[PDB]
Amino acid sequence: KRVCRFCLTEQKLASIFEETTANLPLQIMAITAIEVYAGDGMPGHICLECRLLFEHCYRFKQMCKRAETLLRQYPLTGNWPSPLEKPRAP
Amino acid sequence: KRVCRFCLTEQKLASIFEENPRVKTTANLPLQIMAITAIEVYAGDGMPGHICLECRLLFEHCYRFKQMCKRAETLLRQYPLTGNWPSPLEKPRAPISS
Amino acid sequence: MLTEKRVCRFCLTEQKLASIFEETANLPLQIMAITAIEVYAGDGMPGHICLECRLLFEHCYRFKQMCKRAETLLRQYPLTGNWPSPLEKPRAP
Amino acid sequence: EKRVCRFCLTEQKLASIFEANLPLQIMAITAIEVYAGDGMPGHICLECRLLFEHCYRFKQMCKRAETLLRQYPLTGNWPSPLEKPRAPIS
Ligand SMILES: [Zn+2]
Ligand SMILES: [Zn+2]
Ligand SMILES: [Zn+2]
Ligand SMILES: [Zn+2]
């Protein structure tokens, strides 16, 4: 009855909609292209492990986009960008 | 000058466009990149042509996670057709190197 | 916040603007789904969208929703034995 | 019945998805991975193919608009309004 929408566990659940640049629905869309909204008829909960993996993947996506902007702007700024912080183990 | 396109490291690089025998992967790397960043990489685009091992592992990890989330969605959407509630899924392992 | 000028974030027009945040999927979610661009109030980029860009986001999002409905109905056929009928395409605004 | 459009299920005006390339456009707009032999319909109608082209060109314009906005503080060149993509000729 109460499961994680993403891995179907019953353990360590909380609301997807319970309160970062991006809310968890935005993160889920960015990483999996799954649409979630309150009252969509699908499970409304996520386990801690799935929540932390969404946050980890989303920080990866943010780093990739920062790398892309700095590389593209390098011919305008002339400042070669230093290595970025990789997001570490969830 | 020779850096990871994604984290800008100089360490542990390989070509984005070569098969990497060190990482068991489940889809081609340009597709994995596109899924997360919407960046369409190609040989000769003028951008760094390399990726570090950790960025390759992260791309594979995000793809495996997406595949589990989609399996969960299919099983949940099919439940009203049979009334058999789907069991917890076997989670994808974090990808590791070699 | 020099980028926070009064244009459409997506086509740079000054005409027929409203807030991206003006009260299913909200427009920020649609933008993410179609372009992978993160928008939030105070992100330092333009906070407005023209009517035409808003309709194009809604049109592309309805296309994505139709593609997903087709996939769900196709994957149900081996369970139900009912072949799904053709879906209504969204028409360009 | 047998050959339908993967995306709208029509039997009309079909061609192969296979032979930007259309697989890339499909991933770019819907995050669906299609490949020959995936077990799913391998055809697309003209209208769905044109909708993918139109959504891909919109996404391209949004990306170009972001790059042009982000370079403005570095150069002082304010970008003028962009030519929106028109629905492509049949
Ligand atoms: Zn979970
Ligand atoms: Zn890297
Ligand atoms: Zn606009
Ligand atoms: Zn179609």
Side-chain angles (χ1 to χ4, degrees), chain A residues 1-11 13-18 20-87 89-90, chain B residues 1-21 23-69 71-89 91-92 94-98, chain C residues 1-3 6-21 25-90 92-93, chain D residues 2-90:
Chain A
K1 188 140 37 159
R2 244 85 205 275
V3 299
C4 177
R5 182 166 182 161
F6 304 104
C7 72
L8 303 186
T9 192
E10 333 84 327
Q11 304 308 283
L13 295 184
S15 178
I16 292 173
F17 307 105
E18 121 148 337
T20 177
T21 59
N23 61 33
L24 181 55
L26 207 65
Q27 295 184 35
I28 289 160
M29 181 63 72
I31 300 309
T32 65
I34 298 176
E35 181 187 72
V36 312
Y37 62 90
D40 61 7
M42 290 281 281
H45 300 82
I46 183 169
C47 83
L48 183 50
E49 182 174 341
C50 281
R51 182 186 294 269
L52 292 170
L53 195 49
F54 278 110
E55 288 173 4
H56 172 70
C57 289
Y58 195 76
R59 286 191 295 275
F60 180 61
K61 170 183 207 253
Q62 285 175 311
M63 175 196 75
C64 291
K65 183 192 166 48
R66 188 177 198 90
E68 175 81 8
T69 303
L70 291 166
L71 286 166
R72 292 283 180 188
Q73 286 185 170
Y74 164 65
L76 285 171
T77 63
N79 296 324
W80 184 257
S82 301
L84 303 186
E85 216 234 51
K86 281 173 264 179
Chain B
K1 171 269 130 52
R2 237 164 166 272
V3 298
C4 179
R5 180 167 180 159
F6 300 109
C7 76
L8 306 184
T9 192
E10 290 182 69
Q11 306 323 310
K12 297 214 231 84
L13 298 185
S15 181
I16 288 173
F17 304 106
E18 292 179 350
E19 291 199 317
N20 196 330
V23 176
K24 183 81 195 187
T25 68
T26 56
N28 67 85
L29 175 59
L31 184 156
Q32 290 183 353
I33 290 164
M34 161 157 206
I36 299 308
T37 69
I39 303 157
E40 290 161 16
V41 302
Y42 59 92
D45 59 8
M47 285 291 281
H50 301 85
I51 181 171
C52 70
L53 184 56
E54 288 169 45
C55 286
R56 184 74 194 76
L57 295 170
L58 278 156
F59 276 115
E60 173 66 20
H61 195 183
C62 289
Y63 179 91
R64 288 183 187 184
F65 182 43
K66 167 172 172 192
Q67 302 324 121
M68 177 192 75
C69 295
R71 173 125 215 73
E73 180 161 31
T74 301
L75 286 173
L76 290 164
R77 290 200 180 292
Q78 287 177 350
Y79 162 66
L81 307 164
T82 70
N84 295 323
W85 189 258
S87 281
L89 301 176
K91 282 181 168 75
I96 154 189
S97 194
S98 284
Chain C
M1 93 146 215
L2 262 193
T3 43
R6 246 181 72 89
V7 298
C8 178
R9 182 165 180 161
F10 303 107
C11 74
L12 277 18
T13 191
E14 283 170 274
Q15 281 150 149
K16 293 124 130 262
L17 299 182
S19 180
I20 289 173
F21 312 102
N26 65 26
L27 181 56
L29 196 58
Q30 291 178 27
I31 290 163
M32 182 60 72
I34 299 311
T35 63
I37 295 166
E38 181 188 68
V39 304
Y40 61 91
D43 59 13
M45 286 283 281
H48 300 83
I49 185 168
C50 78
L51 192 51
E52 296 183 33
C53 285
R54 181 185 301 263
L55 292 169
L56 278 156
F57 276 107
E58 166 75 3
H59 170 259
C60 291
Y61 194 78
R62 287 194 302 251
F63 181 60
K64 172 184 190 197
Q65 283 180 309
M66 178 196 78
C67 293
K68 292 307 266 154
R69 175 89 169 293
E71 173 152 21
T72 298
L73 290 176
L74 288 164
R75 285 185 183 305
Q76 284 181 15
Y77 161 65
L79 283 58
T80 67
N82 289 327
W83 190 261
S85 78
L87 306 180
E88 172 74 341
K89 281 156 267 180
Chain D
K2 152 86 311 195
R3 284 161 71 272
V4 299
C5 178
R6 181 163 186 160
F7 302 108
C8 77
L9 302 176
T10 190
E11 282 182 316
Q12 289 212 85
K13 293 159 192 257
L14 297 185
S16 180
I17 291 172
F18 311 102
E19 249 72 55
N21 65 79
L22 177 60
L24 187 159
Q25 288 190 349
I26 291 159
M27 230 308 152
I29 298 304
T30 64
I32 300 174
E33 186 184 341
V34 303
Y35 60 91
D38 59 10
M40 289 281 293
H43 300 83
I44 183 172
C45 78
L46 184 54
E47 280 172 26
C48 286
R49 191 183 291 262
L50 293 173
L51 280 159
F52 275 110
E53 167 70 15
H54 191 226
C55 292
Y56 182 81
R57 292 324 186 155
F58 179 62
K59 175 183 177 163
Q60 191 188 29
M61 176 199 70
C62 295
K63 284 165 67 184
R64 181 163 86 72
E66 174 162 342
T67 304
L68 287 162
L69 283 164
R70 290 184 179 298
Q71 61 79 56
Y72 166 64
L74 302 170
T75 68
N77 298 326
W78 186 259
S80 76
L82 274 7
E83 178 167 12
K84 272 156 263 194
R86 302 103 48 177
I89 166 279
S90 291

